[PDB]
Amino acid sequence: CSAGQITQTSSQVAAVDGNQAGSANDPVLVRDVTVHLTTDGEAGVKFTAINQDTSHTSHTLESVTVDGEEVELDDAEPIERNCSLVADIQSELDLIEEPEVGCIQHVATSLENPGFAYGGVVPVEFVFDTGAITIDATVSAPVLESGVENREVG
Amino acid sequence: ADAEKVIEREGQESFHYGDYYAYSKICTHIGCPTSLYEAQTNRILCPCHQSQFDALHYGKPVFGPAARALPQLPITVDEEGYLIAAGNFIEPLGPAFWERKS
Amino acid sequence: VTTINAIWNLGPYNPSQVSAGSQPDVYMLWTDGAARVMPAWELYLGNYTIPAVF
């Protein structure tokens, strides 16, 4: 009865703050799209743009915006088929290694905070050469280095 | 993705604060703490007699002895950035008693 | 030879906490099971209500 066409294990999404857009049939997918805002005030947009266009029409992320406000990002190579452009703030981007095998590329981001609130949700608008993709994303702090922080009373 | 498909209850429109919702932990059947929040199915569950409340359908019961939705608490951030109760419960929380309207 | 009601690992009571297996004693399980199998029929009469546990 649980192994039917409607199944609990099949409908699940990842346990991450980032929203996602695109079906398996869509040309370009954005996974894990989130607005990061560290406690020190710096902010940016984490996401991963994956190209799966079966026409092999390699794209280039022209721009990204949060509520129409610009986010800085540079040195974004074109994304040919079966390639991932991972984007995150520079401090968090430094924590993981760029893979020499595979098509992945790492790119840094930053945006001036207009006053976004932790907890809320804000639209995010991507525009690539082949079109625009819109998706609402939440605002949250980056993840702590696990195990280092204690509850401090004052 | 799950906050998109929330159904708001008539009169409880602005109680949430973004992603945050705040329901009463006391079951509306007999008052055990509900406390079993299924993170994917989004069903708040009561272990005492297996009531299931849909966290997306304003906490309305979906299974078990419970007949009534969990009351909701309005919340908002304060001047300093902590979370505060922005109001009182509009509905008597806990188990029902004889003179409780609805 | 057999442990019964090992209270030392349940902790003291406070109304905000509960366990998955929290049934009453065995001789009370019948009156628990009744409350589990009642199909939630509740009456509302203006200013009054008969709960589903009546």
Binding site: G115, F116 | E10, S102 | -
Partner: peptide
């Protein structure tokens, strides 16, 4: 056999954006 006041809203919850006041800097 359902509560009279337990009615789903007509409002369709278009997003209400949130902000916090910024320091003068």
């Amino acid at each position: 056999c359902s509560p009279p006041h337990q009615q789903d809203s007509p409002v369709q919850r278009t997003n209400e954006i949130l902000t916090t006041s910024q320091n003068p800097t």
